[PDB]
Symmetry: C3
Subunit: 458 residues, 3 copies
């Protein structure tokens, strides 16, 4: 009696789960919104510098209109290698944002010290792998909260707390090629093994190298650590990068998971649209919304408010034809990266709509109870839109100088709605709806032409 | 000199052969129509209860318009596992009809007893594998005839005879989870090994278990049995589920095989249409045609008549824009499951056309010589249309409460054309073309609203 | 720590490189045009007789409109097997033209004798593999030049010299199933091992068999030969047919390589169009342009002129909506196989345009300096268009009786523009723009109806 080859089945649930971390795939929590969970772990925030520049170069004529295709190919080739290291070292990739990603090692408190060693080693091997591109890595460790928010058909999650703020601070300090530990990470780690240098004006520290003691064997140490890793592929599945590759059809589970994924990606998963379609360099408008709270580390304070804001944001975006691409803690608060002009959401009046949408969101969110300040940055231009990451773990994202510009506007001009000149000039709105603003020198930004506040009708 | 990896070639002929049993793939018989062949074998008829209900639930809002996708995924996940067992145990899947399939073990007469043991074991392992779904299995054994019928561009086959009637009777008696043997099967089997209980008012019997004798080893027994299995994958191809996976391009053979497959499936095979396209939950009209004969077991009596009827059915369907989905022996006769509204055959007046087509077919077939009675049931609603089965053996089929309703109408209201209320109400035809009928309690049917006879113009 | 399966990545650069020989993929030469390189090698020219006939038969009704699909499947099944032998024996397939291909073994001069043995053995194994189809093979050896020509967005290459003329002469003499050596090949080969018969009126010779000496072992001999093969897959990659299967994303390299591939193929590579789309049997017009030079073996004489002609040809084709399918040395000169009506280049007035384009090209090229004679043959009909070869090495090409007719017209009627009757009759041009020509008996051609010179306006 034969025992024939059992071919890999790439069921739709498996393709869906590629777009999500184990934190959600195997999370099985309440459908109530908001939902909050608390745990500890080590976070790794990995940034590839230079793709933003590259994006602008891939619109040039030398790319012969295959710029999007070339950009995603060279990006994924690099990012995939990083994704594999994170996964082999036992991490869960939580989210991709442009050419960066955030990974988590969730463990019990007693195991943070040893897991920190594992992550540092991971980081050094990644810093290893890496012709104009640098890798910067920030690490943090401690208490983490998760929030899930959304409505009956859409779900989103985010992580919150001091470790989340710390990992992003650590990463902003990294010079090209550094691995930086948060103060708390340094404080919890196995200092007898990890050799650091101080960072000026900073309690965070830079990793120089591992200094293992005499009888230390990393493979044996790693194996002990896998005891604590719930989803590490093992035994018969030790040849797989993710346990999620073995997920089996389950309509309840798939209904729950699909709510995290955008409709155009589900179309592609369901072989109702060609893959090529989602890799594009297209003119869009970014609307980058920031909500600042009294205490951005206290999930049960901020969770209700994010949900409240999300309910209004989503209904307004539906009307003005925009979409939430990503949400994360960023700029002392919760940020929504929204996009006008994604697959199948073209219009004329896109610019006007992005501006009217932004004002509406600003007025509403300004009044929701624990929101201290709202800031919104609007910028328009050619940006890369596509699926970034590894075959087994990837997400739809946007990369482009205008994406960064909108984020920087929202941070340097708090408490108002701002726009760039392309949006100002392009919009059908009268000039006295706007105010020309003082030019601020902005981190990471060369020369935006004039910037404007969208004052609205008075 | 290298000996490089020889990658699997999924030639078009191989993809075609996935839609057909070895009985046709390796049959090499005359292109003359009708063509009849005679042999012996054991038949297995496997039914998954509950998908029909599920279908109705997958149109609900909780499925967020991915109902078709979810339904086919969960169906195929289960059915594929059954298909693999049948194939590993040496059977040929002849046909899929909704969430059921029919499998054949064709052997010489002297080998029926031993092969019956093999099939029972197969059945018990399948009953094994199987959250609202039961598996019912009927087995029969004996003489079988095959008919091939069609025209210069389309071919169809069916099996006929007492064993075919018996396997369907056996399966209608199975309580959830039973394996039932036909009287003749019980009479030919190795009774010293097979422990049964009687079935009330019935000569068919229920399998309780296998009671192997002392030195009996199933693997060695199975291996002896493979001597008689012409196409069992072996040697270098023992890792494959079907020998058909090795078929090589042959234009003569492919011309012959493609005639069994519908044009929209050939389009997909030829990568001229996205796969997603054929899995749908769409409103259609089922026209379920039954031809009753004096003796439905005598192929050479009935074969000419089925061909005659097919020639007219197909020309009328072409005019009224319908398609034959499936043909089989069912309801004391030969049944054609026809569909109005399949990929690319949308229209308005679909309902009217289905009714005029049904009348035309009724008048013509009523006059063909050995056809004793014609019955036709017409029902309209949302039904699942798609490819069901395993990667290596699958077919296009329809599942839905309206499919069952049309079959039951055709059986409970013989000798006339009947329709449901959706069709009555929806049609552009005057009310006095119809007659409102007495409500009959029907096996498997809750509450069809009113039913009607399509009387026609008088 | 796991070491998980590293799945084959079929990056776009890899898919591009399938369409090109190692001579270009790993060539890294100047982007200047024309560019010329010089080396030595052995050439193999392999022709499958009979597909041209088959093409005409695959338009018949028995193919039920899947003629293109069937033709490409049966063609590729045969051609793929030849491609694998060439590759396993260490050759580089340079180009496909219809049902023929040209392969190169590039080596240093001292190694030609031994490599000739390898190629003969290859040829005999191929003649081995080969229901109406014969394989004819011609071999040549010696000095070879390569020319690359084109503009900022398109590139083409060709090989030139006596060995290139010889391999095509050798192949025209081969009777069904022969392997023929050029005079120079015979002169350089290891005559103590290769047993030949003379060919009447010819210095070229026919291979009867290999006569190895006593201690000769072909595997050991082949292994010694692999020392000289730069790109032979080895070690960890010994299971691959081409080293190109391992190419890694590199935007510079991909920009350079894509210029050789037509836009509709890049569309398919980029998953922006279904694969089925490019296999077609469609009515087109072939415009077969031949440039004759004083000395067609002297690349530095002829290279500038081919570039000059290409610059004008391409701009005129752009205007009249044609495309260069292929360029090669053929008919005592450089030939351009151009096509009117390829994917997405339909029009009415196609025939007129092909004729006005041909005249324009004739007038211009007639005046470029070292071009002695221009001849152009125009023929219209149903031809097969599609990707021919092996998964790892394949190209877009055209096969059809009208392709051959246009080539034969251009050779038998030199120095003028000629057209067939379909084109004459179909064109919107007045009859006195043409002259009816004397019927010539033409090699490989049954009965073209009348042929015409396109005289133009006087
Ligand atoms: Ca970045
Ligand atoms: Ca059923
Ligand atoms: Ca040829
Ligand atoms: Cl997050
Ligand atoms: Cl049947
Ligand atoms: Cl060439």
């Amino acid at each position: 009696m034969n025992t024939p080859k059992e071919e890999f089945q790439d069921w739709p649930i498996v393709r869906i789960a590629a777009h999500l971390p184990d934190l959600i795939v195997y999370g099985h929590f309440s459908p109530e919104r908001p939902f909050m969970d608390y745990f500890d772990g080590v976070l790794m925030f990995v940034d590839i510098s230079g793709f933003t520049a590259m994006t602008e170069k891939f619109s040039s004529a030398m790319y012969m209109d295959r710029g999007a295709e070339q950009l995603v190919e060279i990006l994924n080739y690099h990012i995939s290698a990083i994704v594999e290291k994170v996964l082999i070292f036992g991490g869960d990739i939580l989210k991709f944002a442009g050419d960066a990603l955030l990974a988590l090692w969730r463990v019990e408190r007693k195991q943070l010290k040893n897991i920190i060693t594992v992550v540092i080693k991971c980081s050094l091997e990644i810093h290893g792998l890496f012709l104009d591109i640098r890798v910067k890595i920030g690490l943090a460790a401690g208490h983490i909260s998760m929030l899930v928010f959304g409505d009956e058909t859409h779900s989103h999650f985010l992580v919150i707390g001091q470790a989340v703020d710390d990992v992003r601070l650590a990463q902003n300090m990294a010079q090209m090629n550094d691995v930086i530990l948060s103060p708390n990470c340094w404080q919890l780690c196995d200092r007898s093994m990890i050799e650091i240098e101080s960072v000026p004006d900073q309690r965070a520290v830079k990793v120089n190298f591992l200094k293992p003691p005499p009888n230390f064997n990393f493979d044996e140490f790693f194996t002990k650590c896998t005891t604590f890793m719930h989803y590490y592929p093992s035994g018969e599945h030790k040849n797989l990068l993710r346990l999620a590759c073995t997920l089996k059809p389950d309509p309840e589970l798939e209904m729950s998971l699909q709510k995290y994924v955008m409709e155009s990606i589900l179309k592609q998963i369901d072989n109702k649209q060609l893959q090529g379609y989602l890799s594009e360099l297209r003119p869009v408008t970014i609307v980058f919304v920031n909500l600042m709270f009294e205490d951005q580390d206290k999930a049960e304070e901020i969770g209700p408010a994010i949900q409240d804001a999300y309910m209004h944001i989503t209904s307004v975006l539906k009307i003005f034809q925009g979409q939430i691409n990503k949400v994360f803690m960023f700029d002392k608060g919760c940020s929504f990266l929204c996009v006008f002009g994604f697959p199948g959401e073209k219009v004329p009046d896109e610019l006007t709509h992005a501006l009217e949408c932004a004002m509406d969101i600003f007025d509403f969110c300004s009044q929701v109870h624990k929101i201290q300040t709202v800031s919104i940055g609007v910028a328009s231009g050619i940006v890369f839109c596509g699926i970034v990451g590894h075959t087994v773990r990837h997400e739809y994202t946007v990369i482009g100088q205008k994406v960064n510009l909108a984020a920087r506007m929202m941070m340097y001009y708090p408490g108002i709605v701002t726009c760039d000149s392309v949006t100002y000039n392009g919009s059908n709105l009268p000039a006295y709806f706007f105010k020309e603003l003082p030019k601020k020198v902005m981190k990471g930004v060369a020369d935006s032409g004039p910037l404007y506040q969208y004052w609205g009708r008075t």
